[PDB]
Amino acid sequence: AFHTHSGIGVPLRRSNVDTDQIIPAVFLKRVTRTGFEDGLFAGWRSDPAFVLNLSPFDRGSVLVAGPDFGTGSSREHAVWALMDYGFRVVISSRFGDIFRGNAGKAGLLAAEVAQDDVELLWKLIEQSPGLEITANLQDRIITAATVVLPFKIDDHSAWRLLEGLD
């Protein structure tokens, strides 16, 4: 279940965010499957001025990231970390291939959007922290304030999300 998700958008101006940054290896074991929320961005969250430590971004569930998010040797874990923290949508102009595949299978919506449109969303969120971004899977659009943007997702991913096979 899910044709639409709404949540506080979190601006993250970082390119080539790789698996190790999303969830550091020290947190992993191979049979563990719960409680990855503390390991999400665990290194970056050491700084009290990291965006995820700031209200109201600390309660966000829609992540707006730089190009090539989820890059490197992806992990189901990286997707697990985001999900456990409470993020249901990641927006980027380009995803790591392995990461994108894994996202849909895991109940996380990875929306690819034009970079022009990424910089646009960053501005909205940064001028108005708390602004909510909506992702509509039926129409394949992202909405923020009165700005409406198309996004791409492969139909197999869409089908897994819509069928709620999380």
PDB file of C-alpha atoms in Angstrom:
ATOM      1  CA  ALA A   1       0.000   0.000   0.000  1.00  0.00           C
ATOM      2  CA  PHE A   2       1.258   3.490  -0.913  1.00  0.00           C
ATOM      3  CA  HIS A   3       0.457   5.536  -3.966  1.00  0.00           C
ATOM      4  CA  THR A   4       1.518   8.772  -2.210  1.00  0.00           C
ATOM      5  CA  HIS A   5       4.007   9.679   0.537  1.00  0.00           C
ATOM      6  CA  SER A   6       4.435  13.062   2.221  1.00  0.00           C
ATOM      7  CA  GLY A   7       7.203  13.999   4.608  1.00  0.00           C
ATOM      8  CA  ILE A   8       9.577  16.676   5.711  1.00  0.00           C
ATOM      9  CA  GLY A   9      12.201  17.058   2.985  1.00  0.00           C
ATOM     10  CA  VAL A  10      15.842  16.910   4.085  1.00  0.00           C
ATOM     11  CA  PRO A  11      18.395  18.766   1.943  1.00  0.00           C
ATOM     12  CA  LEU A  12      21.695  16.935   1.639  1.00  0.00           C
ATOM     13  CA  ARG A  13      24.191  18.636  -0.657  1.00  0.00           C
ATOM     14  CA  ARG A  14      26.578  15.697  -0.976  1.00  0.00           C
ATOM     15  CA  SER A  15      27.618  14.031  -4.214  1.00  0.00           C
ATOM     16  CA  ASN A  16      28.723  10.438  -4.594  1.00  0.00           C
ATOM     17  CA  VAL A  17      27.320   9.485  -1.206  1.00  0.00           C
ATOM     18  CA  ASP A  18      28.553   5.950  -0.833  1.00  0.00           C
ATOM     19  CA  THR A  19      27.452   2.903   1.167  1.00  0.00           C
ATOM     20  CA  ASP A  20      30.091   3.465   3.872  1.00  0.00           C
ATOM     21  CA  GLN A  21      28.801   6.974   4.513  1.00  0.00           C
ATOM     22  CA  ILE A  22      25.151   5.859   4.641  1.00  0.00           C
ATOM     23  CA  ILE A  23      25.996   2.968   6.998  1.00  0.00           C
ATOM     24  CA  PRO A  24      29.595   2.288   8.208  1.00  0.00           C
ATOM     25  CA  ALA A  25      30.841  -1.308   8.119  1.00  0.00           C
ATOM     26  CA  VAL A  26      31.454  -1.330  11.882  1.00  0.00           C
ATOM     27  CA  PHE A  27      27.667  -1.470  12.294  1.00  0.00           C
ATOM     28  CA  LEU A  28      27.258  -4.629  10.220  1.00  0.00           C
ATOM     29  CA  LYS A  29      27.390  -8.321  11.098  1.00  0.00           C
ATOM     30  CA  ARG A  30      25.781 -10.391   8.343  1.00  0.00           C
ATOM     31  CA  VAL A  31      22.869 -11.853  10.312  1.00  0.00           C
ATOM     32  CA  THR A  32      21.630  -8.593  11.807  1.00  0.00           C
ATOM     33  CA  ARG A  33      18.392  -7.226  10.356  1.00  0.00           C
ATOM     34  CA  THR A  34      16.993  -4.628  12.784  1.00  0.00           C
ATOM     35  CA  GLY A  35      17.829  -1.306  14.378  1.00  0.00           C
ATOM     36  CA  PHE A  36      19.995   0.237  11.695  1.00  0.00           C
ATOM     37  CA  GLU A  37      18.538   3.683  12.465  1.00  0.00           C
ATOM     38  CA  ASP A  38      21.477   4.637  14.700  1.00  0.00           C
ATOM     39  CA  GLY A  39      24.008   3.802  12.013  1.00  0.00           C
ATOM     40  CA  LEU A  40      22.444   5.965   9.350  1.00  0.00           C
ATOM     41  CA  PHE A  41      24.998   8.668   8.619  1.00  0.00           C
ATOM     42  CA  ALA A  42      26.505   7.802  12.014  1.00  0.00           C
ATOM     43  CA  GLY A  43      29.803   9.574  11.240  1.00  0.00           C
ATOM     44  CA  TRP A  44      28.271  12.750   9.859  1.00  0.00           C
ATOM     45  CA  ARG A  45      25.741  12.860  12.687  1.00  0.00           C
ATOM     46  CA  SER A  46      28.649  13.380  15.083  1.00  0.00           C
ATOM     47  CA  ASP A  47      28.519  17.071  14.209  1.00  0.00           C
ATOM     48  CA  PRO A  48      25.600  18.836  15.900  1.00  0.00           C
ATOM     49  CA  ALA A  49      25.316  20.978  12.758  1.00  0.00           C
ATOM     50  CA  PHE A  50      24.792  18.038  10.458  1.00  0.00           C
ATOM     51  CA  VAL A  51      21.386  18.578   8.830  1.00  0.00           C
ATOM     52  CA  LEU A  52      19.950  15.391  10.335  1.00  0.00           C
ATOM     53  CA  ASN A  53      20.573  16.721  13.826  1.00  0.00           C
ATOM     54  CA  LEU A  54      18.611  19.892  13.102  1.00  0.00           C
ATOM     55  CA  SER A  55      14.946  20.431  13.771  1.00  0.00           C
ATOM     56  CA  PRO A  56      12.759  19.866  11.904  1.00  0.00           C
ATOM     57  CA  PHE A  57      15.021  17.860   9.554  1.00  0.00           C
ATOM     58  CA  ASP A  58      15.573  15.268  12.265  1.00  0.00           C
ATOM     59  CA  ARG A  59      11.989  14.151  11.662  1.00  0.00           C
ATOM     60  CA  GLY A  60      12.154  14.108   7.863  1.00  0.00           C
ATOM     61  CA  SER A  61      11.234  11.149   5.667  1.00  0.00           C
ATOM     62  CA  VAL A  62      12.088  12.522   2.227  1.00  0.00           C
ATOM     63  CA  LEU A  63      15.775  12.894   1.397  1.00  0.00           C
ATOM     64  CA  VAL A  64      17.009  15.225  -1.357  1.00  0.00           C
ATOM     65  CA  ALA A  65      20.599  14.304  -2.237  1.00  0.00           C
ATOM     66  CA  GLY A  66      23.338  15.213  -4.718  1.00  0.00           C
ATOM     67  CA  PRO A  67      24.084  13.181  -7.876  1.00  0.00           C
ATOM     68  CA  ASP A  68      25.168   9.542  -7.629  1.00  0.00           C
ATOM     69  CA  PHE A  69      23.632   8.770  -4.280  1.00  0.00           C
ATOM     70  CA  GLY A  70      24.090   5.184  -3.071  1.00  0.00           C
ATOM     71  CA  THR A  71      27.231   4.759  -5.096  1.00  0.00           C
ATOM     72  CA  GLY A  72      30.083   2.309  -4.545  1.00  0.00           C
ATOM     73  CA  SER A  73      29.421  -1.283  -3.598  1.00  0.00           C
ATOM     74  CA  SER A  74      25.887  -0.846  -2.342  1.00  0.00           C
ATOM     75  CA  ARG A  75      24.386  -2.803   0.532  1.00  0.00           C
ATOM     76  CA  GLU A  76      20.906  -3.985   1.243  1.00  0.00           C
ATOM     77  CA  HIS A  77      22.033  -2.486   4.558  1.00  0.00           C
ATOM     78  CA  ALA A  78      22.318   1.059   3.203  1.00  0.00           C
ATOM     79  CA  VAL A  79      18.670   0.754   2.137  1.00  0.00           C
ATOM     80  CA  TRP A  80      17.796  -0.826   5.504  1.00  0.00           C
ATOM     81  CA  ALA A  81      19.435   2.055   7.371  1.00  0.00           C
ATOM     82  CA  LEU A  82      17.380   4.677   5.523  1.00  0.00           C
ATOM     83  CA  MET A  83      14.174   2.705   6.032  1.00  0.00           C
ATOM     84  CA  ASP A  84      14.679   2.126   9.757  1.00  0.00           C
ATOM     85  CA  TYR A  85      15.445   5.795  10.322  1.00  0.00           C
ATOM     86  CA  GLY A  86      12.122   6.603   8.662  1.00  0.00           C
ATOM     87  CA  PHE A  87      13.000   7.756   5.125  1.00  0.00           C
ATOM     88  CA  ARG A  88      10.536   6.487   2.513  1.00  0.00           C
ATOM     89  CA  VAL A  89      11.742   8.556  -0.410  1.00  0.00           C
ATOM     90  CA  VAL A  90      15.135   9.471  -1.718  1.00  0.00           C
ATOM     91  CA  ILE A  91      15.423  12.005  -4.522  1.00  0.00           C
ATOM     92  CA  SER A  92      18.546  12.377  -6.642  1.00  0.00           C
ATOM     93  CA  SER A  93      19.443  13.098 -10.248  1.00  0.00           C
ATOM     94  CA  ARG A  94      21.303   9.784 -10.462  1.00  0.00           C
ATOM     95  CA  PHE A  95      21.441   6.691  -8.187  1.00  0.00           C
ATOM     96  CA  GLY A  96      24.038   3.943  -7.774  1.00  0.00           C
ATOM     97  CA  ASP A  97      22.741   1.023  -9.864  1.00  0.00           C
ATOM     98  CA  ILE A  98      22.960  -1.570  -7.092  1.00  0.00           C
ATOM     99  CA  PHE A  99      21.330   0.813  -4.652  1.00  0.00           C
ATOM    100  CA  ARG A 100      18.414   1.611  -6.963  1.00  0.00           C
ATOM    101  CA  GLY A 101      17.657  -2.082  -7.573  1.00  0.00           C
ATOM    102  CA  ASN A 102      17.684  -2.774  -3.824  1.00  0.00           C
ATOM    103  CA  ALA A 103      15.514   0.264  -2.966  1.00  0.00           C
ATOM    104  CA  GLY A 104      12.306  -0.946  -4.579  1.00  0.00           C
ATOM    105  CA  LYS A 105      12.690  -4.476  -3.288  1.00  0.00           C
ATOM    106  CA  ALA A 106      12.995  -2.973   0.192  1.00  0.00           C
ATOM    107  CA  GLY A 107      10.033  -0.554   0.229  1.00  0.00           C
ATOM    108  CA  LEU A 108      12.075   2.606  -0.368  1.00  0.00           C
ATOM    109  CA  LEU A 109      11.186   4.902  -3.243  1.00  0.00           C
ATOM    110  CA  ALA A 110      14.231   6.058  -5.217  1.00  0.00           C
ATOM    111  CA  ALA A 111      13.014   8.922  -7.443  1.00  0.00           C
ATOM    112  CA  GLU A 112      15.305  10.162 -10.163  1.00  0.00           C
ATOM    113  CA  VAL A 113      14.818  13.841 -10.953  1.00  0.00           C
ATOM    114  CA  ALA A 114      16.616  16.364 -13.187  1.00  0.00           C
ATOM    115  CA  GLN A 115      19.494  18.095 -11.399  1.00  0.00           C
ATOM    116  CA  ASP A 116      17.995  21.518 -12.260  1.00  0.00           C
ATOM    117  CA  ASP A 117      15.004  20.223 -10.296  1.00  0.00           C
ATOM    118  CA  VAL A 118      17.169  18.970  -7.461  1.00  0.00           C
ATOM    119  CA  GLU A 119      18.741  22.410  -6.950  1.00  0.00           C
ATOM    120  CA  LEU A 120      15.200  23.760  -7.064  1.00  0.00           C
ATOM    121  CA  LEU A 121      14.013  21.509  -4.200  1.00  0.00           C
ATOM    122  CA  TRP A 122      17.112  22.279  -2.129  1.00  0.00           C
ATOM    123  CA  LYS A 123      16.286  25.952  -2.368  1.00  0.00           C
ATOM    124  CA  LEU A 124      12.693  25.402  -1.277  1.00  0.00           C
ATOM    125  CA  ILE A 125      13.674  23.306   1.743  1.00  0.00           C
ATOM    126  CA  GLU A 126      16.529  25.544   2.779  1.00  0.00           C
ATOM    127  CA  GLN A 127      14.428  28.725   2.601  1.00  0.00           C
ATOM    128  CA  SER A 128      11.585  26.944   4.405  1.00  0.00           C
ATOM    129  CA  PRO A 129      12.807  24.128   6.656  1.00  0.00           C
ATOM    130  CA  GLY A 130       9.767  21.977   7.454  1.00  0.00           C
ATOM    131  CA  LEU A 131       8.451  22.174   3.927  1.00  0.00           C
ATOM    132  CA  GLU A 132       6.934  18.819   2.953  1.00  0.00           C
ATOM    133  CA  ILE A 133       7.761  17.017  -0.292  1.00  0.00           C
ATOM    134  CA  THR A 134       5.137  14.693  -1.752  1.00  0.00           C
ATOM    135  CA  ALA A 135       5.901  11.753  -4.043  1.00  0.00           C
ATOM    136  CA  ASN A 136       2.990  10.410  -6.103  1.00  0.00           C
ATOM    137  CA  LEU A 137       3.756   7.025  -7.585  1.00  0.00           C
ATOM    138  CA  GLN A 138       0.565   6.789  -9.650  1.00  0.00           C
ATOM    139  CA  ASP A 139       1.278  10.017 -11.543  1.00  0.00           C
ATOM    140  CA  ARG A 140       5.067   9.881 -11.075  1.00  0.00           C
ATOM    141  CA  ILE A 141       5.337  13.454  -9.788  1.00  0.00           C
ATOM    142  CA  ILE A 142       7.079  15.207  -6.906  1.00  0.00           C
ATOM    143  CA  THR A 143       5.215  18.155  -5.383  1.00  0.00           C
ATOM    144  CA  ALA A 144       6.572  20.864  -3.105  1.00  0.00           C
ATOM    145  CA  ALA A 145       4.659  24.036  -2.289  1.00  0.00           C
ATOM    146  CA  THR A 146       3.189  24.761  -5.722  1.00  0.00           C
ATOM    147  CA  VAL A 147       6.103  23.399  -7.749  1.00  0.00           C
ATOM    148  CA  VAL A 148       5.416  20.102  -9.543  1.00  0.00           C
ATOM    149  CA  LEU A 149       8.197  17.943 -10.990  1.00  0.00           C
ATOM    150  CA  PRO A 150       8.218  14.682 -12.900  1.00  0.00           C
ATOM    151  CA  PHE A 151      10.372  11.804 -11.680  1.00  0.00           C
ATOM    152  CA  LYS A 152      11.419   8.484 -13.182  1.00  0.00           C
ATOM    153  CA  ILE A 153      11.292   5.039 -11.635  1.00  0.00           C
ATOM    154  CA  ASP A 154      11.397   1.712 -13.433  1.00  0.00           C
ATOM    155  CA  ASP A 155       8.030  -0.040 -13.529  1.00  0.00           C
ATOM    156  CA  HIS A 156       9.216  -3.153 -11.640  1.00  0.00           C
ATOM    157  CA  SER A 157      10.207  -0.985  -8.688  1.00  0.00           C
ATOM    158  CA  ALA A 158       6.910   0.852  -8.923  1.00  0.00           C
ATOM    159  CA  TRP A 159       5.015  -2.433  -8.851  1.00  0.00           C
ATOM    160  CA  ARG A 160       6.845  -3.633  -5.720  1.00  0.00           C
ATOM    161  CA  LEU A 161       6.127  -0.394  -3.919  1.00  0.00           C
ATOM    162  CA  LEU A 162       2.471  -0.206  -4.958  1.00  0.00           C
ATOM    163  CA  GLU A 163       1.850  -3.831  -3.950  1.00  0.00           C
ATOM    164  CA  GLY A 164       3.353  -3.103  -0.527  1.00  0.00           C
ATOM    165  CA  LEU A 165       5.726  -6.077  -0.723  1.00  0.00           C
ATOM    166  CA  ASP A 166       8.132  -4.204   1.604  1.00  0.00           C
TER     167      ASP A 166
END
